[PDB]
Amino acid sequence: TRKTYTLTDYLKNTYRLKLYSLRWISDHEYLYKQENNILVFNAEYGNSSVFLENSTFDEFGHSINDYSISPDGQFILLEYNYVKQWRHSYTASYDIYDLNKRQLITEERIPNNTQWVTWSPVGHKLAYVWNNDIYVKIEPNLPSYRITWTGKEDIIYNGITDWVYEEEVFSAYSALWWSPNGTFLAYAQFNDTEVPLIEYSFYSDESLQYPKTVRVPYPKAGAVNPTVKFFVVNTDSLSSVTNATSIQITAPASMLIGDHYLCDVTWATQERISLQWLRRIQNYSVMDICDYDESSGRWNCLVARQHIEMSTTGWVGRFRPSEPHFTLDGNSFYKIISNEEGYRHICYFQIDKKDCTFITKGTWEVIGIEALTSDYLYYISNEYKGMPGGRNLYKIQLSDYTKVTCLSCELNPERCQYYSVSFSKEAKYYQLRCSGPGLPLYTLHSSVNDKGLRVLEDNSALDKMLQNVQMPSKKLDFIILNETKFWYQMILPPHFDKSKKYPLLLDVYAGPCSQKADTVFRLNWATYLASTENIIVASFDGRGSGYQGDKIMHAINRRLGTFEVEDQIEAARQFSKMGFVDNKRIAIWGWSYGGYVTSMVLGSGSGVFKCGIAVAPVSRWEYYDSVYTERYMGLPTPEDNLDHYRNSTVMSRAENFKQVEYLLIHGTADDNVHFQQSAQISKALVDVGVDFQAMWYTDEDHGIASSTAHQHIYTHMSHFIKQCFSLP
Amino acid sequence: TRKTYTLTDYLKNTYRLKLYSLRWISDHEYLYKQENNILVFNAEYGNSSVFLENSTFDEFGHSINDYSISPDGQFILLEYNYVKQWRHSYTASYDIYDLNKRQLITEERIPNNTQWVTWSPVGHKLAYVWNNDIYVKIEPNLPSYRITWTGKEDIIYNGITDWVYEEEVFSAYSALWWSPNGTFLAYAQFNDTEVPLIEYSFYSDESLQYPKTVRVPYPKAGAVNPTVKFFVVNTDSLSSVTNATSIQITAPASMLIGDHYLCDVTWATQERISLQWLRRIQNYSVMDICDYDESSGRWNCLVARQHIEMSTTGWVGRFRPSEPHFTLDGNSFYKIISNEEGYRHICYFQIDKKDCTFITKGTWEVIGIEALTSDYLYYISNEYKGMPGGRNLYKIQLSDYTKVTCLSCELNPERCQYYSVSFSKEAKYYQLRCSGPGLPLYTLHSSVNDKGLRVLEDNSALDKMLQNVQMPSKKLDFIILNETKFWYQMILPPHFDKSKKYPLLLDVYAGPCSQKADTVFRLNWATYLASTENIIVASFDGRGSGYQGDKIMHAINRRLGTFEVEDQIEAARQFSKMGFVDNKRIAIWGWSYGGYVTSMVLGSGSGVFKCGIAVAPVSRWEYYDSVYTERYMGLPTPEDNLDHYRNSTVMSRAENFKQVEYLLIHGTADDNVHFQQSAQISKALVDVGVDFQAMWYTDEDHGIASSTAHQHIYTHMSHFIKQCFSLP
């Protein structure tokens, strides 16, 4: 008699997952917003105090988007007038409220339309970027010092990233890096002078008579890339009478010989900074370690302290060279790198030694290094039970690498197989965040003896609500292909009956280093399709997928649109051979990279799929950006890899769409995968006389996430899938 | 069983309609293309000779797109490298062939990318526009003389129209007018300096990496319009002076007080030119008649020869003030104008007398004046049988207006009721073109005795083919609403049975002065729908439609989106009451103004229609151009008609679309009705949570006429209609 999880439940968020987002402010306490109030918690005992009244700003007059308390707890930055730009970038207005004198600062306030702002790591200095230039405020109420004067819209970027560096390299708008104690402020400068612009229309509200043309410096594959320079400035010796002097750190000669990128910046100590550079041909990167010289006031990077990282099977790193984790004295560091077997493990480096030593090993991979103390290094890996889609927290004794302890594996194995972690300032405490297969579970622990102090949030409220719903189940397993196992997951309908034939929807992404088969608990479209429509929603990680070593991940190097596409068909083929699958009703769908694979599959002539949906897909690699595309495809020149760039397009397979039902969807204001990609797909289908379904979303970008568009797309796709499967 | 007229028959054009396109080159000879070669026929006897052998240019090195013989027959203009622009404009290359010498001229050649070229009306002078400047060639092989130096891409246009003048005013790209014997060359100059630009992307072939942004000076309703100036240069003086003076003829004071347009240029004699001007508020126009002053070399327009033409019920003219037809001596002229009853009839004017004399009258209208001789005036009207949808040729004796003979009415009344005509150079002969209700019939006649000389093309071949096909029948009739007749037509399925209930498709356009109910024979989408799908396709001409007097035409003055929308809904009801229509299956569809009406109807909440298709619709009048929009809606300001502008949008009825099935279609490169218009409709529908069907056509314009796209859109629309009507 109980209800199912419906489309409306998914769209209106009827069943909400509770979270516990805390912010560590020291090694013993953290901030947590409750009832709109900000409380400070003592980790050891769990007791709290109110830190900021949810009414303190009742007469502020502005809607506060977010807040940020200075490291010393003396000030709070109030963010408002938020205006989103790309994936991470946005502008906003700011105000600083003095917590000591319980007063709002009105003198020398941060400008409106500020592009980025950040407190120093210690104390209360500020650094913000406005009009592409960097500014520093030693005190919240004092006048700021201008650090750069070359800032120019769409041309010169000081302290912030341009489009491609924001999206593909740093995953952030900021290009500012404070030294550990706030003395130095390092920053990058980007020059997009010769980078072509992508142009597309923006219609805006109906009142706008003429559509606006948006123009963004965006380097497509093979095009001219922005250039980059790196600087360091001493914020302790700034003058009101003299323009701040920034010291430049140039990239190594092996980098200056041609196009290159700055791919990582990590401080080692108060006077030592490391930088990793990557060549445009992303199989070779160099780390420079630089020390501040009090005599010349310059930064020297000893050649003997250089570290090269290259790859012979593919590119370097998962999406970019990994970041180094320096020890207290900065004389050595730990870094995740691909080992001789092609598995990513932690290597220990001496700053002036070429050979590093691997401290972990095995047919599994370290996902990331989470914390470092003189006795232990904490990290997350998918080692447990050999499940590449599981994640657990481990610590390894630095004095004896044979001593590895899993800290989360056995806490609750049935409910928790995928963890994330948050350590306090000195790793004295850590918060564990279990996200599956059962309902999310947040706990707090102490490092000295790894005690489980308390449960922060167990989602018992949601568990109670879900008891009255017929929820689908999840099967995570694998199939073998040529001696190699590949994992898949299936979202199975309630009361699954293996003696019946169920329609099947293959949910695919399949980009390089992707993972779609995991132990994560999710309430999404697939939950509804399985719960209400009785559709099996499956996903498969084939060649090119991540966290299983380079042999699998690099199989598609310089060859996108091949093995990862073929493997999805092979998986479907195998699923169709299963007793509970109706081989007459198998569909496939994907978004972004997933739209591309779905389209390449439907245009393969395999005959396995009856219909498919591609959302904002890539259609030909020459249309996507250089940093991501070239990493996997090299350059599109006859001397490099043009032939495959031309053989891996969706358009060339148009004719094969005659035997399938295809729905193509795309937002007109997509700054990431340009509408162009879908406009070329539709034109090729028209040119060979193939009928298909389409839907454009006016002014929506790659996320098609505005509330109304989101509901509209999923509603439209549901009708399409049900119609394809002959479902009432 | 006889096969029916299928979708493939329409898309593949299996039943080809033959025609007979001839070009008069004198008072008794015409050119005709047969077997790909150009023949010259003697009108009087029907005999001919090969004018230009099809192999004459087998090694020209290019595909000849079109040709043009100079009036004196001494040269032939060869046009190639045709590159289409808007509805009438295009660029091309040209070569000139000396017919006597049989050689292709190779010196002082017309430039590539020439915007327009035209022979002088007599002899073989040439005037062409290149890079927006006018040039004149006295002899085909000699250097040309530059006439203007102000030419400026998208800014200053000399001798050619800008976008809005091309589309809405002159229906042509050229803006130059040779005087009768070719001595003078008159021309307009348009300045779009402050006209806003419509911008949209053009994706082009898949090889183009970055989309192209098309930018066109296009004035939307209420925006800054281009300004205009008129000039006349004496070409006979070009070889005598270094820089011949272009004498300007200024607009009258009545026009200079505000924004205005040049709407007509017509030469009266070798030394008399007439021009008509129109105020931005299109209900007042002025015609100046200007004489060349041999002593000053200037042009003077005597105010006593100025003619005013204003309208109290609407705008002036059907789409623009009508053109004058001067008698040989240039002292009088005939012009079609709305009489006191609102019916358009021929008025005879003395050039220096303001009151004119109507020479025709009645409750019908004159469509156009086709020829004028010293004794007779020939015109086309819908007088016959009081059928506003019919057209016939008439002759009226200039010395006795009571003597009016219909030259086409009785030729073949059952087969022919819609005629157009083509007179020889001095009207000695005329070709009659019958286009319906039966198969087109082309005949040649002698003006001296109005006797038929012979049949040129009777379409016997097609008639034979259609014998084996179950063709639909067509009904043209009227219904009385408010004691006034409103015509409609219905394409009826074969073997129609008034005792059955047929699904009905309302084919609508309904813009001002439109006519969708007529006696023309058509082989189109509706033919297939009726013949194969047994669907009744109907059209109705309600308030706002033309050729029936101003009472009906001006009924929507300043009120677009009202009566013409309601009458369409009311027509469906009336059709329901006819008894052979299935009220559960009534659909509506239209293109352009038609897409707008369709959308307005589907959003009216009438409950009458089940589904509808809007192709390239207008969605809000402020997005359409100034000249057309303001003519019917006035200005979008609070002091004028802004409230109705804001009240007649499709977007404000979004909520009502929940009651119907909608398919929205638009070409992305539509320079006329911008994609913007459908982008706002879709957004408004997404915003209120309405599901609908959509389809964009990459790089197609308002005509979506490319071969592949054309077949694709009609195939897509057929599936939608059949599905809505539950048809196999």
Ligand SMILES: CN(C)C(=O)[C@@H]([C@H]1CC[C@H](c2ccc3ncnn3c2)CC1)[C@H](N)C(=O)N1CCC(F)(F)C1
């Ligand atoms: C899965 N996601 C969100 C991504 O791949 C995006 C990016 C997400 C951030 C990644 C990135 C960058 C640095 C870094 N350092 C550590 N992790 N890490 C991850 C790079 C790829 C990618 N730029 C994108 O939007 N695409 C659309 C077309 C496409 F499919 F083809 C790629």
Ligand SMILES: CN(C)C(=O)[C@@H]([C@H]1CC[C@H](c2ccc3ncnn3c2)CC1)[C@H](N)C(=O)N1CCC(F)(F)C1
């Ligand atoms: C029916 N047609 C083809 C037209 O109305 C078009 C034009 C065709 C030429 C006419 C024109 C101009 C001068 C003239 N002189 C004599 N006849 N004549 C006709 C004006 C209207 C109009 N500019 C158009 O494209 N619209 C799309 C949106 C819209 F529906 F709202 C109007």
Ligand SMILES: *[C@@H]1O[C@H](CO)[C@@H](O[C@@H]2O[C@H](CO)[C@@H](O)[C@H](O)[C@H]2NC(C)=O)[C@H](O)[C@H]1NC(C)=O
């Ligand atoms: C942050 O670290 C810097 C660098 O070590 C410290 O600055 C040095 O301080 C010493 C002692 O006062 C001076 O002798 C040096 O000349 C300083 N060097 C530079 C480059 O400024 C700074 O004191 C530290 N700041 C904090 C807050 O601890």
Ligand SMILES: *[C@@H]1O[C@H](CO)[C@@H](O[C@@H]2O[C@H](CO)[C@@H](O)[C@H](O)[C@H]2NC(C)=O)[C@H](O)[C@H]1NC(C)=O
């Ligand atoms: C059509 O045929 C007539 C004869 O039937 C041709 O007439 C010739 O006309 C020229 C003048 O142009 C005379 O000098 C000839 O003597 C006429 N010949 C005859 C036999 O009468 C006429 O040229 C033909 N026209 C075409 C285009 O072929």
Ligand SMILES: *[C@@H]1O[C@H](CO)[C@@H](O[C@@H]2O[C@H](CO)[C@@H](O)[C@H](O)[C@H]2NC(C)=O)[C@H](O)[C@H]1NC(C)=O
């Ligand atoms: C086209 O129109 C523009 C006005 O919109 C003219 O430009 C002006 O020209 C004057 C005279 O030289 C200048 O002082 C102004 O600065 C110009 N205004 C603008 C907005 O540009 C232009 O001269 C006209 N061109 C022609 C050939 O008539």
Ligand SMILES: *[C@@H]1O[C@H](CO)[C@@H](O[C@@H]2O[C@H](CO)[C@@H](O)[C@H](O)[C@H]2NC(C)=O)[C@H](O)[C@H]1NC(C)=O
């Ligand atoms: C031919 O005459 C026209 C008209 O005087 C010249 O055009 C003028 O050129 C001057 C200087 O180049 C400008 O300051 C004026 O604004 C122009 N007037 C017009 C109406 O365009 C043209 O330059 C002359 N050509 C030659 C070769 O002398």
Ligand SMILES: *[C@@H]1O[C@H](CO)[C@@H](O[C@@H]2O[C@H](CO)[C@@H](O)[C@H](O)[C@H]2NC(C)=O)[C@H](O)[C@H]1NC(C)=O
């Ligand atoms: C075309 O018409 C023009 C204008 O009437 C003729 O040129 C005039 O010719 C007369 C002689 O008959 C002269 O007195 C005038 O000076 C000319 N006027 C101008 C403006 O040039 C021209 O001769 C006619 N062309 C032909 C071939 O008859």
Ligand SMILES: *[C@@H]1O[C@H](CO)[C@@H](O[C@H]2O[C@H](CO)[C@@H](O)[C@H](O)[C@H]2NC(C)=O)[C@H](O)[C@H]1NC(C)=O
């Ligand atoms: C949590 O509880 C402790 C007491 O158990 C609070 O007290 C500590 O800090 C106070 C002021 O900062 C001192 O008055 C106490 O002496 C000190 N306790 C000890 C044992 O030294 C602590 O402040 C509380 N934290 C919060 C956030 O409320």
Ligand SMILES: *[C@@H]1O[C@H](CO)[C@@H](O[C@H]2O[C@H](CO)[C@@H](O)[C@H](O)[C@H]2NC(C)=O)[C@H](O)[C@H]1NC(C)=O
């Ligand atoms: C940003 O890059 C540009 C171009 O790469 C630098 O300018 C150089 O390139 C120009 C081409 O547009 C040349 O014309 C210039 O001579 C050359 N140098 C200068 C000073 O323009 C530009 O300087 C860079 N800007 C910064 C702040 O580094």
Ligand SMILES: *[C@H]1O[C@H](CO)[C@@H](O[C@@H]2O[C@H](CO)[C@@H](O)[C@H](O)[C@H]2NC(C)=O)[C@H](O)[C@H]1NC(C)=O
């Ligand atoms: C950024 O913009 C805000 C909003 O305009 C500025 O705050 C004041 O806003 C009021 C109206 O809300 C205006 O009357 C004032 O002119 C604005 N300025 C001041 C000083 O009152 C704010 O000042 C701007 N910030 C900066 C750094 O210019």
Ligand SMILES: *[C@H]1O[C@H](CO)[C@@H](O[C@@H]2O[C@H](CO)[C@@H](O)[C@H](O)[C@H]2NC(C)=O)[C@H](O)[C@H]1NC(C)=O
């Ligand atoms: C990283 O990959 C690149 C690209 O495959 C290698 O560069 C060369 O690639 C070309 C084809 O573009 C081949 O002909 C060469 O054999 C490759 N090697 C060289 C030295 O040119 C590059 O070698 C790889 N780098 C590493 C360190 O393995």
Ligand SMILES: *[C@@H]1O[C@H](CO)[C@@H](O)[C@H](O)[C@H]1NC(C)=O
């Ligand atoms: C803070 O404001 C919110 C407004 O939604 C209110 O619900 C909450 O109770 C307030 N906090 C306290 C402690 O009253």
Ligand SMILES: *[C@@H]1O[C@H](CO)[C@@H](O)[C@H](O)[C@H]1NC(C)=O
């Ligand atoms: C700082 O540099 C900028 C830009 O070069 C200059 O305009 C300004 O006057 C300088 N100020 C001082 C104090 O040198």
Ligand SMILES: *[C@@H]1O[C@H](CO)[C@@H](O)[C@H](O)[C@H]1NC(C)=O
């Ligand atoms: C092994 O399997 C892979 C796919 O997993 C296939 O591409 C390959 O051709 C097979 N053979 C060998 C020798 O690897």
Ligand SMILES: *[C@@H]1O[C@H](CO)[C@@H](O)[C@H](O)[C@H]1NC(C)=O
């Ligand atoms: C004219 O050329 C065509 C080819 O397009 C050819 O078929 C025909 O024979 C030629 N004309 C004559 C009279 O032969």
Ligand SMILES: *[C@@H]1O[C@H](CO)[C@@H](O)[C@H](O)[C@H]1NC(C)=O
């Ligand atoms: C037109 O362009 C072609 C190709 O660029 C060139 O060969 C030819 O000479 C040009 N003709 C003229 C008249 O400029």
